[PDB]
Amino acid sequence: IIGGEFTTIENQPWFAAIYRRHRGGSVTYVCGGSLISPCWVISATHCFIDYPKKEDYIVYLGRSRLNSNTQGEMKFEVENLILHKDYSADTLAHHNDIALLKIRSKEGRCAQPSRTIQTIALPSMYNDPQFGTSCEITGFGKEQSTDYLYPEQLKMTVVKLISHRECQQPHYYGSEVTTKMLCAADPQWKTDSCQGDSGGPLVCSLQGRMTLTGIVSWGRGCALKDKPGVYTRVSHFLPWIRSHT
């Protein structure tokens, strides 16, 4: 997250932190996700496509810090890793950038909700907020494009939804952006998602309810003028989500 503010998991208790084992046993951060039911985390396919083996991954819920344990956190193995069959990689733009992880502990259990661990509602079909609506993004991604490190403390920021029409102008992303993607950005291009925030939530208030509107997918640079963040448009994937869960 470029700009924005530090936060803790209590403020975004559906946030999932996804890591990968090595290869010698070191464990490194991969991507964010969102808890949509006790046993299911939703994320982005591009996070896992290079290492598509479920046994390599560890999922934490209730975690506020990158490399230290947060009190009350839960740790899971991935019982099931479901990548979207129609995924494709353009140079920048990933299509159908969506994935499901069925989570299960050593003890064979799913997430127990708590103050630090809650589910997030999916939107009703094809129902998104109007452009200019303020939504929030959360992640452990880079604080600056040039950074080598990820922040140790979770961050969040606010971005505004951009219309299909505005985002498809060539000055922005041209044809790279489809109707199954959503754009969002700061009017000053001052704050944004970045590398390491992939798979995490774009949450908007809909019908007076916090709703998973988007999943961090791609962008050119981070917090670059005329280059919004691009998000998987969750309201266009409900049949896929329902079927595979």
Instruction: Dump strand ranges (E) for 130-243.
Output: 134-139, 155-162, 181-185, 201-205, 210-218, 229-233
> Least distance (Å) from ligand 94I to the CB of residue 221?
4
Tell the burial category of 220 from Cβ atoms under 10 Å away from its Cβ (0-12, 13-18, 19+). middle
Pairs from 103-107 (Cβ < 8 Å, separation ≥ 24): 103/39, 103/40, 103/41, 103/59, 103/61, 103/76, 103/77, 103/78, 103/79, 104/39, 104/76, 104/77, 104/78, 104/79, 105/74, 105/75, 105/76, 105/77, 106/77
Can residue 153 be called a binding residue for ligand 94I (CB under 6 A)? no
The verdict on whether 175 is a catalytic residue reads no
Distance in angstroms (rounded) separating the CA atoms of residues 209 and 101: 24
33 binds ligand 94I (CB under 6 A): no
Is the CB of 168 or the CB of 193 nearer to ligand 94I? 193
- Both structure tokens of 123: 């939107």
Q: What's the longest Cα–Cα distance across the chain?
A: 52
Q: If binding is defined by CB under 6 A, does position 222 make contact with ligand 94I?
A: yes
Can you tell me which of 20, 218, 235, 236 binds ligand 94I, judged by CB under 6 A? 218
- Name which of 33 and 219 has its Cβ closer to ligand 94I: 219
Q: Report the C-alpha dihedral over residues 39, 76, 83, 125, rounded to 10 degrees.
A: 30
Q: Which residues contact 40 (CB under 8 A, 6 or more apart)?
A: 100, 101, 102, 103, 245
Ranges within 109-138 binding ligand 94I (CB under 6 A): none
Stretch that binds ligand 94I, among 79-87, 102-110, 165-173, 212-220 (CB under 6 A): 212-220
Q: Which stretch binds ligand 94I (CB under 6 A): 18-26, 59-67, 163-171, 195-203?
A: 195-203
Catalytic: which of 34, 43, 193, 198? 198
**Whole-angstrom distance, CA of residue 109 vs CA of residue 229:** 35
Could you tell me the end-to-end alpha-carbon distance of the chain, in angstroms, rounded to an integer? 29
Contact with ligand 94I (CB under 6 A) among 43, 45, 193, 235: 193
Name the active-site residue from 97, 128, 186, 197.
Answer: 97
Residue 232 sits in the site that holds ligand 94I (CB under 6 A): no
**Among 136, 135, 148, which Cα is nearest to 195's?**
148
145 binds ligand 94I (CB under 6 A): yes
Task: Work out whether 198 is an interface residue with ligand 94I (CB under 6 A).
Answer: yes
Residue from 82, 99, 135, 216 binding ligand 94I (CB under 6 A): 216
Select the residue interacting with ligand 94I from 195, 238, 240, 244 (CB under 6 A).
195
Which residue of this chain has its Cβ atom nearest to ligand 94I in the complex? Answer: 219
Active site residue 46: yes
Q: Is 97 a catalytic residue?
A: yes
Residues that bind ligand 94I (CB under 6 A): 145, 192-195, 197-198, 216, 218-219, 221-222, 227, 229
Catalytic residues: 46, 97, 198
